[PDB]
């Protein structure tokens, strides 16, 4: 049975229905925001804003207005629900430009997407939080896995008084990871020195830059493992370690309010070449750090950038062919 999310205004006069709350960005386009409102004209608006702070700064990034009543093809969902609901049911559709930032919150500021349905004569008129309805939807970023070589980093240290190298190489099993997906780290040490590696520490760190109003750069670990694996003088070490970055912490970028079950760590910001890195508001990225903790010597580390994405949505006949309501809450 197909789920459809609904929400009514306070006075029970307008209800909005949506198939979904999160709309996947597929880089060349975003899933369309295909809804129905069950009903002065009736307007429906989609707004994207950055907010900082209660509030102390706001920048509008995108607005789209639809007149829904009175009246590109309807989705099966719209038709299905129009028939299954009446003739007071009207379609609205937005297409979100793919270059707008995805939903992101850092604890405070963020980028949010709000759908607003209201009844009113012109577009420039007094909105009454009484017969209007407001829904926070999300844009979440997908990207496909990359063909070809994985991520790879290496470093060489010579310690005081010596010219023998401690060499570290690491790579990741992928360039593109999805929420909940484990990261495998291949670690290769050649220790030609007379120091001993006492342990190995692997972390996943997020970096989040605030780019508007009050700029700032946060860092914050989202996975940490240490192993008491030792690398003796004149010995090599190869081992694969596995870490998964997990939400289950101030300064952390999330895609969502920390209070909701369906919130994840923020996805990596995909940046177009010379795009306005200011109307994105928050830039998020991720690295794996591999560190050799050296006895009687400074530690030796590499970092391996990676991208964290939201996952993509889940008899003779030569082909095979073949609706419940929920609160938006």
């Amino acid at each position: 049975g197909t789920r459809v999310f609904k929400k009514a205004s306070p006075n029970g006069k307008l209800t909005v229905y949506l198939g979904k709350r999160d709309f996947v960005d597929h880089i060349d386009l975003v899933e369309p925001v295909d809804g129905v409102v069950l009903v002065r004209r009736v307007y429906v608006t989609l707004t994207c804003a950055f907010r900082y702070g209660g509030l102390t700064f706001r920048k509008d990034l995108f607005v789209a207005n639809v007149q829904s009543f009175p009246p590109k093809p309807l989705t099966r969902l719209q038709e299905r629900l129009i028939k299954k609901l009446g003739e007071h049911a009207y379609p609205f559709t937005f297409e979100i430009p793919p270059n707008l930032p995805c939903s992101v919150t850092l604890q405070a500021c963020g980028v949010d997407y709000e759908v607003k349905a209201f009844c009113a004569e012109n577009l420039e008129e007094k909105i009454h939080k009484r017969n209007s309805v407001r829904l926070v939807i999300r844009k979440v970023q997908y990207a496909p896995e990359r063909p070809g070589p994985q991520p790879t980093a290496e470093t060489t240290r010579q310690f005081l008084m010596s010219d023998k190298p401690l060499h570290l190489e690491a790579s990741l099993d992928k360039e593109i990871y999805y929420h909940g997906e484990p990261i495998s780290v291949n670690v290769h040490v050649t220790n030609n020195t007379n120091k001993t590696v006492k342990k190995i520490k692997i972390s996943v760190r997020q970096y989040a830059d605030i780019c508007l109003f009050n700029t700032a750069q946060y860092k914050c670990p989202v996975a940490m493992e240490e192993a008491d694996d030792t690398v003796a003088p004149s010995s090599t070490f190869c081992k694969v370690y596995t870490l998964t970055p997990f939400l289950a912490k101030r300064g952390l970028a999330l895609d969502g309010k920390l209070k909701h079950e369906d919130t994840n760590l923020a996805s990596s910001t995909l940046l177009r070449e010379g795009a306005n890195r200011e109307i994105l508001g928050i830039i998020v990225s991720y690295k794996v750090k591999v560190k050799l903790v050296v006895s009687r010597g400074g530690d030796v580390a590499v970092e391996l950038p990676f991208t964290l994405m939201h996952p993509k949505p889940k008899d003779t006949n030569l082909i095979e062919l073949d609706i419940v309501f929920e609160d938006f809450a």
Partner: protein, 349 residues
């Protein structure tokens, strides 16, 4: 500086989560700019609706080929000699047929007819009713042993054009069949298209047949009228122009052709991913450029812009069309051909 075309990348199929292995001539079809259809094998088809490419439908199949209707939510499927046509809307099997001979190539040639090519013959099969395939003509011996790469018809379906290729240099062999005369002719060509074109002062449209080839004389484009000029018509003077290729593109040859009747221009695509524009009337070359680093291996008319759309081996969906605000000044100033520019401005606006 301004260009006589607009080129666009509409999307990359892998961004939709499509497996790049499934992106090629045998697993991917696009019979019109409305759908892309992909067979993904643990079998099924992914139908991408280009009005809404975000919400692809996935269905299980056991077909070795699937070709979406150009216009409607209707899909033809085959498994060996077994052909079936399905209405996705009404979820019903419309029609089925079992061929005597294997169908080695097929495509929709309008809104409601499939062309079927066997080792032996070419058939048209309506999607409607209970009518069986109608044999249109026997295959000519000069396509014997070719890979069949296309099948074209004119607007009245009175002229039918089967195209195959073989490794020998890649030789192009066409068979042009006249439905009224019931006669085939062999033509050496690699890509072709028909068009309607009405000459100045003529009573009726001419049916034009345009074909491009890279043969013993190198690259050539021919434009001819097929059939006897209508009462009230002058004949269309045959045109023949060179199709240029690089020094770097010694092994390149034409692979696709679409004609815009809105602008009377021929779009030609080469294996290496070059696009050319030619004037339909004179064959004059208007533009050439490499637009893709991979073969564009499937093309269709791009209806909204009257251009050409296609898919390349890396999953990029690309199109080209006339840029109507630049084409005349481009022909005037960049090509310095003010006679062509005025003629096209007047002919089409």
């Amino acid at each position: 500086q301004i260009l006589p075309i607009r080129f666009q990348e509409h999307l990359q199929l892998q961004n939709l989560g499509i497996n790049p292995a499934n992106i090629g001539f045998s697993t991917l079809t696009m019979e019109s700019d409305k759908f892309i259809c992909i067979r993904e094998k643990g079998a099924q088809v992914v139908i991408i609706d280009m009005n809404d490419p975000s919400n692809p439908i996935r269905r299980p199949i056991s077909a070795d080929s699937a070709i979406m209707n150009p216009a409607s939510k209707v899909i033809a499927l085959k498994a060996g000699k077994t052909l079936q046509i399905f209405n996705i809307e009404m979820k019903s099997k419309m029609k089925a047929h079992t061929m005597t001979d294997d169908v080695t190539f097929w495509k929709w040639i309008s809104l409601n007819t499939v062309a079927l090519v066997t080792d032996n013959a070419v058939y048209h099969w309506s999607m409607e009713g209970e009518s069986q395939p109608v044999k249109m003509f026997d295959r000519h011996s000069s396509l014997a042993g070719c890979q069949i790469i296309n099948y074209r018809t004119d607007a009245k379906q009175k002229w039918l054009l089967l195209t195959g290729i073989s490794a020998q240099r890649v030789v192009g062999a066409m068979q042009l069949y006249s439905v009224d005369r019931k006669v085939s002719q062999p033509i050496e060509g690699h890509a072709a298209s028909f068009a309607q074109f009405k000459m100045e002062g003529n009573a009726e449209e001419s049916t034009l047949f345009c074909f491009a080839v890279r043969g013993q004389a190198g690259g050539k484009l021919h434009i001819i009228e097929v059939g006897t000029p209508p009462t009230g018509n002058q004949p269309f003077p045959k045109k023949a122009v060179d199709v240029f290729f690089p020094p770097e593109a010694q092994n390149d040859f034409p692979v696709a052709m679409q004609i815009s009747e809105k602008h009377d221009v021929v779009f030609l695509i080469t294996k290496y991913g070059y696009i050319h524009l030619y004037d339909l009337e004179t064959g004059t070359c208007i533009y050439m450029n490499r637009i893709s680093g991979e073969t564009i291996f499937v093309t269709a008319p791009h209806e909204a812009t009257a251009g050409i759309i296609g898919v390349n081996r890396k999953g990029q969906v690309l199109s080209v069309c006339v840029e109507e605000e630049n084409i005349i000044p481009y022909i005037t100033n960049v090509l310095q051909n003010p006679d062509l520019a005025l003629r096209m401005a007047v002919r089409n606006n």
